[PDB]
Design a protein around this ligand. Sequence first.
Ligand SMILES: CC(C)(COP(=O)(O)OP(=O)(O)OC[C@H]1O[C@@H](n2cnc3c(N)ncnc32)[C@H](O)[C@@H]1OP(=O)(O)O)[C@@H](O)C(=O)NCCC(=O)NCCCC(=O)O
Ligand SMILES: CC(C)(COP(=O)(O)OP(=O)(O)OC[C@H]1O[C@@H](n2cnc3c(N)ncnc32)[C@H](O)[C@@H]1OP(=O)(O)O)[C@@H](O)C(=O)NCCC(=O)NCCCC(=O)O
Ligand SMILES: O=C([O-])CC(=O)C(=O)O
Ligand SMILES: O=C([O-])CC(=O)C(=O)O
Lengths: 435, 435
Amino acid sequence: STNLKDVLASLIPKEQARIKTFRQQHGNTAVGQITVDMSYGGMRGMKGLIYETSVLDPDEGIRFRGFSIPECQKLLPKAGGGEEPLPEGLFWLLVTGQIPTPEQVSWVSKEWAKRAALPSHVVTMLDNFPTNLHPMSQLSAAITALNSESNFARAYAEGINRTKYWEFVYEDAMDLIAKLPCVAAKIYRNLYRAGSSIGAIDSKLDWSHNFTNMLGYTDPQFTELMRLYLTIHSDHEGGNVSAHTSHLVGSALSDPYLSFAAAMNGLAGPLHGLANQEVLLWLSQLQKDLGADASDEKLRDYIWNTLNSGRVVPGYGHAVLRKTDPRYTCQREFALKHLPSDPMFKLVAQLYKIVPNVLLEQGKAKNPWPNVDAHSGVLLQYYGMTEMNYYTVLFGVSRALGVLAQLIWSRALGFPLERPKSMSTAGLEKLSAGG
Amino acid sequence: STNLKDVLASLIPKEQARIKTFRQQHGNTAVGQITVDMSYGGMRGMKGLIYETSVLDPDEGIRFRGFSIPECQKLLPKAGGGEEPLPEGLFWLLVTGQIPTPEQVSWVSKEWAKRAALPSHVVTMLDNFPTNLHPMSQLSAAITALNSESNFARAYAEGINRTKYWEFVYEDAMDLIAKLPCVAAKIYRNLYRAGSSIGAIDSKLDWSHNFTNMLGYTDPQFTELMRLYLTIHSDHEGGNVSAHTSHLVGSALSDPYLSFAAAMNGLAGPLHGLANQEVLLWLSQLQKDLGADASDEKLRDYIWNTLNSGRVVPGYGHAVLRKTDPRYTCQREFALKHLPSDPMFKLVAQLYKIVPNVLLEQGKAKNPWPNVDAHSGVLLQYYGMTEMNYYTVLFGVSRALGVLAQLIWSRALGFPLERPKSMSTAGLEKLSAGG
Ligand SMILES: CC(C)(COP(=O)(O)OP(=O)(O)OC[C@H]1O[C@@H](n2cnc3c(N)ncnc32)[C@H](O)[C@@H]1OP(=O)(O)O)[C@@H](O)C(=O)NCCC(=O)NCCCC(=O)O
Ligand SMILES: CC(C)(COP(=O)(O)OP(=O)(O)OC[C@H]1O[C@@H](n2cnc3c(N)ncnc32)[C@H](O)[C@@H]1OP(=O)(O)O)[C@@H](O)C(=O)NCCC(=O)NCCCC(=O)O
Ligand SMILES: O=C([O-])CC(=O)C(=O)O
Ligand SMILES: O=C([O-])CC(=O)C(=O)O
C-alpha cells in the first residue's frame, strides 16, 4: 500500500517540467557576481548549487522542505509514548516535500529493518581493524568496501539508460541507510565493548531504537535523545562540506556508497563535523586545567590562550549562520528538560555567556555564536556514551538521510557533472592587471 | 644539500605577501557573474577556485605552472637513456614553479624510496579483500585506513598553531606519494597474480621503475610508458572532480590521506577517470559485436546504438576543453612511435575519424573531440596489462602528484573552508519571480 518509490514516480516528471520551463524563461538571469575575494575565500557568499531538501537562512537557521525544527518537532510522527520526532519521518519529508502519516513512517521503519544486512567481507574488515584507527576512518573504509553490493554501479555497468538512474540510486540509498547503524554499532562494540555482539534487528522497532539496542544502551531517554539527534543532524542545505562532497562525487556517477564515504572523509575534518569530538576534548582539558567549577575570569583566560596559540575555539562560528544555531538551542532545551544539573551541561551553559563575547572582542569571527557541535556531546556523555572519538560517527549516520535524499533528486533531475573553472593567482592578476 | 622543504620555506612568505597586496587592491573586483543556468548546470563556466599548480585553457589544453606538455617533455629530466619525463621532476615543478635539475630530481626519487613502507593493518586488509571488490574501492579504503599514520592529523590533535599546517601537510604528502605504488601494486598482485609478492624498493631507481618492477613488468618500453603516463595524468587544474574533491575535503582540515581517498572515490566515477576503463570495455564489445576489422558504416551504427540507448560514448567530450586533448595527442604520438600496427591502436585511430562527426551530428556534446581516456588503455593493453578494471588505479597514482602539490599550497596560503551557498528551486524562483 505505501511505497515511496511509487510516490517519487509521480513527483519526478512534474518537477522536471517545472524546472524546464523556469530555465526556459530565466536561465540567463544573473543571480550574483563573483569577486576576487570570493575565489580566495572558499566561495564564501557564492550562490553555487541547487539543493532541494533543505535551505539555510543565515538569521533563522535551517528549514527542511520549508519547515523549521520547531515545526518538525511538532508535525513529525513520534514513537508510541514518545516526544521526539522519528528520523524516518524526516526522511519522508525531505524526499517528498510532504509530511508523512504515521502509517507512512512505519513503512519506512520496516523497509529499513528489512534491508539491514552486512556482507562478510565487510564484517571481517571491521573485525581486523586496529583500535588506533579512528572511528570515522573505520566507518568511511567500510562504506567504500560496501560498494561491491551497489545496484546503481551494477546497472550502470549493464548499460542502463540515463533516465532510470534515479531508480537504482533510490535502492542503494535505502539499503545504505539500513545498513549504516549496523556498521556503526559494530565499530562501537569492537572498540569499546570487545567480545560482545551487536545482536539482531527487530523488524518491529524504529531505526533509532534498533540502533541504540545494537550500541548496548537501555535508558529509554537515551532512545529519545537518539531520535532527536538523528533528525537534527540530518541535512544542512548543500554547501556544507559533507553534503557538497557527496553532491560533487555523485555528479560523476560514482555510486551512493562511494559518494557517501567521500562525504564522511569531509565530515571528519576538524572544521566540519569532527568539531563535536573536539568540543568535548577541549572541555575535558578545561576541567582538567581549571577543575570543574571555574570562574568567569578563568574561563576567559583559558579561551584567550587557545586563541593566542593559533587554534580555533570548537563549536563556535559558522560559514553562513550569523546567529545562534537553532540546533544548539534545540539541544539546550532537551538538556534543560532532562539533565539540568549536569556539571558539564552547566559548563556548556556558562561558556554560552562567555565565548561569544571573547570572540567579538577578538574581532575575527564573523559569527561569534555557537553551532550545533557546541552542545551535542554533552548530551551523549550524560547517558554514558563517553567515547568522544566516536561522536562524529553518529553525525555521519544522521547526515546520510539528507544527502541521500538529495542524491536521488540530483539524478532524477539529470544534474550534470559539477565542474567549475579554476584560476591561478598569476592568471587572475593578469585578468585584472595585478596588485 | 637538496631539500624541497627548505625551498618551500622561502617561497611561502613571498607568495603570501603577493596575494595579500593583490587582494588589498582587487578583492572586490568582479570576475564574473552567476546565472540560473550555471547553478543548475554543475557550475559550468563558473570561475570558482584558486588553484596554483596548473591551469587549463579550453583551446590549448593544460599548462603546468605555465608549461605545456610538449615543453615538459623537452625540459624535464629523463631517466638515463630515457626519452620520457620522470614524474618526480614534474612534482618539483608543480610545487616550486621551477624546472628542476637532475640532481634535484634524483633527491625526490631517493626521498620517495625512503618513505615507502606499509603498516601491517593495511597489508592485512588488502590481503583479506574479495576479488569482486573493484580495484578503486580497494585503493580508496586502503588510503583511508593509512590515516592512522598521519602526521598532520597528529599535529593538529596536539594543537599546533595554524601557521605550521603546511609543514605537516608536506610530510604526509611525501609519505603518501611514496606509499601509493606499494598499495597499488599489492592490489594488482593479489587480484591478478595471486601467491606472488611485490618485492622491495630499490633506493636506486626512479619511482616509475620501482612501480613497474612491483607490478611485475620487465619491458623497458613499458617503464617509459609508465613515466609518461604518470606525468601526464598528474593534474588538470582544480575544478575537475578529483582535484576539487581533494580541495574541498582538505579545506575542512581533514588530513591528506582522507582528502586523497575522497578524491579517489570521485575519480572512480564513469564520467571522470573510470572512463579509461569504460573505453576499453566499449571497445571490447565493439570488436566482439563487429569483429576486429570494421567498416566505417559499421562503426557509425555501433556508435549510434550507444547514443540511442541513453548512454555516453566514453573518451569523448569535456567540461572545459573545446578541442582535442593534447594528452590524447601525446599518447597517439607514443603509439605511432612504438606500436603503430597494433589492431586496437588502429581501431582507436579509426574512431578518431568517426566519433567526432557522429557527436557533431547528434548535436548535444559541446566538445565532440577525444579526451585523455580515449587513448590510455590501448597503450597499456599492448604491453600485456589487460586488466581493464585496474586502469583507473594508475590514473589515481598519477593524480596524487598534482593534488598533493596543491594541498601544501592551500594550507601554506591559509585558504579557508570551501562553503558556497546553496539554493532550492523554490527559493530561486522566488528570488527572481518564477517561470
Ligand atoms: C565554522 C568555521 C570554519 C567557519 O569559517 P569561516 O566562514 O571562514 O569563518 P569566518 O568568516 O568567521 O572566519 C573569519 C576569521 O575568524 C576566525 N574564526 C572563526 N571562527 C573561529 C573560532 N571558532 N575560533 C577561532 N577563530 C575563529 C576564522 O578562522 C578566520 O580567521 P583568519 O582570518 O585568521 O583565517 C569557523 O567558524 C570555525 O573554524 N569554527 C570552529 C570550528 C567549528 O566549530 N566547526 C564546526 C562547524 C559546524 C559543523 O560543520 O559541524
Ligand atoms: C566529460 C563530460 C562529462 C562533460 O560533461 P558536460 O560538460 O556536461 O558536457 P556537455 O556540456 O557537452 O553536455 C551537453 C550534452 O551532451 C551530452 N554528451 C556530452 N559528451 C557526450 C558523450 N561523450 N557521449 C554522449 N553524450 C555526450 C551530455 O551528456 C549532455 O547531454 P544532456 O543534455 O542530455 O544531459 C561529457 O563529455 C561526457 O559524459 N563524456 C563521456 C565520459 C568521459 O569520457 N569522461 C571522461 C572525461 C575525462 C576525465 O575526467 O578523465
Ligand atoms: O552548514 C555548514 O556549513 C556546516 C554545518 O553546520 C553542517 O553541515 O551541519
Ligand atoms: O578536467 C576535468 O574536468 C577532467 C579531466 O580531464 C581530468 O581531471 O584529468
